[PDB]
Amino acid sequence: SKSTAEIRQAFLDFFHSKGHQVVASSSLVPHNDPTLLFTNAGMNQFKDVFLGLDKRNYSRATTSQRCVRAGGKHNDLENVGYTARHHTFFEMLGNFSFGDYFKLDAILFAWLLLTSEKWFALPKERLWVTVYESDDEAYEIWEKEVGIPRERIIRIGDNKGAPYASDNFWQMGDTGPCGPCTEIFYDHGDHIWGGPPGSPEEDGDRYIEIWNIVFMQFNRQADGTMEPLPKPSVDTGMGLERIAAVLQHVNSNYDIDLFRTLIQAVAKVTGATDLSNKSLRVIADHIRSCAFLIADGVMPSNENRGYVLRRIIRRAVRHGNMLGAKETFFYKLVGPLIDVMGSAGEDLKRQQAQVEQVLKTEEEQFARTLERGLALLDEELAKLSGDTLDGETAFRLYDTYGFPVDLTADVCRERNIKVDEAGFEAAMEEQRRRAREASGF
Numbered sequence: 001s002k003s004t005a006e007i008r009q010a011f012l013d014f015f016h017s018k019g020h021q022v023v024a025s026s027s028l029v030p031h032n033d034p035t036l037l038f039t040n041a042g043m044n045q046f047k048d049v050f051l052g053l054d055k056r057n058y059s060r061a062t063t064s065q066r067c068v069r070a071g072g073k074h075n076d077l078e079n080v081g082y083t084a085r086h087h088t089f090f091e092m093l094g095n096f097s098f099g100d101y102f103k104l105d106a107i108l109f110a111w112l113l114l115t116s117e118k119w120f121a122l123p124k125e126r127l128w129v130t131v132y133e134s135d136d137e138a139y140e141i142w143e144k145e146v147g148i149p150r151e152r153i154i155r156i157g158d159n160k161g162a163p164y165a166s167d168n169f170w171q172m173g174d175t176g177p178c179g180p181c182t183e184i185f186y187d188h189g190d191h192i193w194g195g196p197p198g199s200p201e202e203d204g205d206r207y208i209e210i211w212n213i214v215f216m217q218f219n220r221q222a223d224g225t226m227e228p229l230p231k232p233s234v235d236t237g238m239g240l241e242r243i244a245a246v247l248q249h250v251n252s253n254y255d256i257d258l259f260r261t262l263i264q265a266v267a268k269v270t271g272a273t274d275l276s277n278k279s280l281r282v283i284a285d286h287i288r289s290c291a292f293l294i295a296d297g298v299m300p301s302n303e304n305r306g307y308v309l310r311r312i313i314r315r316a317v318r319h320g321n322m323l324g325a326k327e328t329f330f331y332k333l334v335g336p337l338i339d340v341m342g343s344a345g346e347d348l349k350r351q352q353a354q355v356e357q358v359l360k361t362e363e364e365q366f367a368r369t370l371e372r373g374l375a376l377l378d379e380e381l382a383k384l385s386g387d388t389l390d391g392e393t394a395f396r397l398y399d400t401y402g403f404p405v406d407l408t409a410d411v412c413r414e415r416n417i418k419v420d421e422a423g424f425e426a427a428m429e430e431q432r433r434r435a436r437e438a439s440g441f
């Protein structure tokens, strides 16, 4: 079967052969978008094109975009290690139409690449599609133009409990380009738990969302109102890791060639032997987001972007500790990561030594309190009455040991213990008041 690198290239070759300009992945960090924490989709760097504020020499494009979803509008951090399909860092394979072609041709391109004997040749019978409930045009295209049996075309309304809050209406953020969308799912088989989209068991890893095709129609405002874009456009994105899993005949993203090699490296540096332990997958995921974010200019800190990075590094280090890592290990995964990323890791390779030292320094800094903080948390859990750790203890771990609340929550979750987030926030606010009182005017 094709390697991850070959799949990435074949996707780009396909759209290039269809007249799409190949554009390089943008950085994970925008210089000119105050509303965006980290790049979360291929469309981010073309936001102004969709808005009609910018025009390129090309009206159609294709990219393999590095994305991080660990904060802001799209945040999958807490899913990592718990599903076969979620990462913090991942590549989104995309094609874009800037007032060029629209619904029918976007759907046809996607179906062709996926199912043609000349291309990916996926078994058509295992593919399901969803459309926005009110998108009658998309429904008809799938039914009559493509020929998907009706039983595998699923209409999804505003299933997130609010107007335009839906799995089939995609939004870049609270503001920005958005529109109804249609998604293609692959059924991995009845040996995996889960049901199709719209079913009670839809959240399972059996029927996995491979490719989202967005019909960009509006610019959402802060009020929540939808202002139409000047030209209806197309924004698509397919998870490289998810399609690689399908193509390599495995069910989990973590079983693709890229992650198999990376997870082996994690076991090596931590001393772990059980290759099935979820901490190996969490760490393999976390090195990708951490190393690339640093390569793209983020430095660990206690505010904004730097704090998300710090949070992820420390959580990864914590997982390494649980695996029994005896010495500083996280920075040792940069080399192995570069070796599996191909041309998609060129920016990281260019800055290898710098990224390594940043990660080494951060882990060493955290090691000053990690073991001691874990010992305290263990003591507090051993005498804990109930299923919820008190907010005062969470705050103490934060204030004294530099444990982000979500890191503490991660440890507790592994023991079926919750954290009183409200109590933690009340303790934070109490400290803020003390600071205001002492500092004065």
Ligand SMILES: C[C@H](N)C(=O)NS(=O)(=O)OC[C@H]1O[C@@H](n2cnc3c(N)ncnc32)[C@H](O)[C@@H]1O
Binding pocket: 040, 041, 042, 043, 069, 076, 085, 086, 087, 088, 089, 090, 092, 170, 209, 210, 211, 212, 213, 214, 235, 236, 237, 238, 239, 240, 241, 242
């Ligand atoms: C096209 C659009 N702007 C968009 O971002 N749609 S989407 O949110 O659904 O993402 C495109 C895709 O990337 C993949 N994807 C999304 N979040 C992911 C994550 N946290 N980890 C791995 N893959 C993810 C999915 O295959 C998915 O259909």
